[PDB]
Amino acid sequence: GHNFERMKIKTPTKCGHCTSILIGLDRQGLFCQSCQYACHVSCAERVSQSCPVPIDPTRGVGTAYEGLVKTPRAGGVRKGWQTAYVVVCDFKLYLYDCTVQDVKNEIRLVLDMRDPDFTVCGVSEADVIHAQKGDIPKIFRVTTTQILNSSSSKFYTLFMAETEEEKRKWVVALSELKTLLRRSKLADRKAFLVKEVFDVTTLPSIRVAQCCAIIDRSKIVIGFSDHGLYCIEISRQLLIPVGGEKENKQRCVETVEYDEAEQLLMMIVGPAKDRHVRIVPSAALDGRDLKWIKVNDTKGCHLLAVGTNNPGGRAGFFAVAFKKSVTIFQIDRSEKRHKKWKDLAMPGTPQSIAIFNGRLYVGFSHSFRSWSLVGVLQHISLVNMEDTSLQFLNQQTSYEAKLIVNVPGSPDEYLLVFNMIGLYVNEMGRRSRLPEVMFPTQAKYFAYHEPYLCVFSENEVDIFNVTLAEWVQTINLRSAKPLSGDGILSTCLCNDSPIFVLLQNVLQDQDSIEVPVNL
Ligand SMILES: [Zn+2]
Ligand SMILES: [Zn+2]
């Protein structure tokens, strides 16, 4: 029988069992080597076991076309077209960079026909004012994600075919697939709608916003690069310096977390040369003069974590990360509202930090470790090196820890999210699911909003249901960047001007914040 091995796929490659491209940045499928068969880890279980072996409209799986097109360089048609490699797969368009002929297995753009606003058509000269006249009949335009409530509103991508005849082929072939998909009546698995909240006229300070957190439906706080922390009462349309104006003069607020049970705001403050942590009672949200409390000996910090799901709802901890150590601080009811609890030496430089369920979690390059904070000292790796299927992590030099998720619905299971993969382990540190979450493109940011992992890249946010280990949505946005720790409040460019968007969970019966209606 086959001798499968986890393989880094170097070029866009169809699964031998289902024909879908093996997307991802690392370990994208299994490869046999005895017979050269390549396939998804999840597909291997149904491949014939005899080794040299002799778009699906329902389930929505399969590669349909693999071709070359031209597409504008980053910046527009005025600067010229460049040859790219397009794959139509799983009712999606995969755009790849290429060089005439070396194609890497990194997608630069995904266009999902499951998008409510997917359309493809030709263009008039007014839609592409800069294309050469003789080129207009060769160009087609694909539309996807609409930004609701916007003040244009839709993500558009232009492709130029080699002939007008090939252009019409492209338009017709993508339309028939969209129509096939619509008729297939596949369940809607999308996670988010995108809603514009503020633009540069309603929030001119948007260009220097660095972070934000939700207080409740009616108000958020936003940290700015030079003006501190402000509380926005959205419906009242009011901008209130947290702790008063004196506290927010020439103050650089880089991150902000809100602890609702304890009524505390916790911040990484400062220009790089005096980065440190400050916390303040959220009574300060109303603009009263109230001095932000300095957390002593947090200079040079690079991460801050406030604990969630504290056991029994106790006040709990926050932790500050340094280059080779972490300090844990206990929240309390004294004047300072906190106290140093414990210094922890770290095996390497923390790359991610979190506290939840009474445990501290720190990620490094190729591991995560946890320290129990209840019953206290006791360090536990989340990867048991007696699991032969996990030993590959020690042999990695390029991995970076991003975040860890306790899987919703699987309390004894964790998703370890690296720059390259998402890996599932149980509480013993052994592998708990054979397939690994793949990301189509190199991520610029990761955020998590239960149960959705949100992976931000240049042209889209890709959404993963952590419970199902399923890629459920592609949200095309231009240079999206999360503002809140959980990403659902983000910024992005709309007609090259910055806007503030909410990623609204379509399963809720009300928006996460009150959205002002844009008319
Ligand atoms: Zn084989
Ligand atoms: Zn497959």
Swiss-Prot record:
The residues the record assigns to binding Zn(2+) 1 are 2, 32, 35, 51
Q: Which residues form the CNH domain?
A: 206-490
Protein name per the record: Serine/threonine-protein kinase mrck-1
Q: Where are the zinc fingers (Phorbol-ester/DAG-type)?
A: 1-51
Instruction: Give the source species.
Output: Caenorhabditis elegans
Entry text on domains: C-terminal region, including the diacylglycerol (DAG)-binding, PH and CNH domains, mediates interaction with membranes, with a preference for di-phosphorylated phosphoinositides (PIPs).
Full-sequence range covered: 957 to 1508 of 1592
Q: Where in the cell is it found?
A: Cytoplasm; Cytoplasm, Cell cortex
Annotated Zn(2+) 2 binding lies at 15, 18, 40, 43
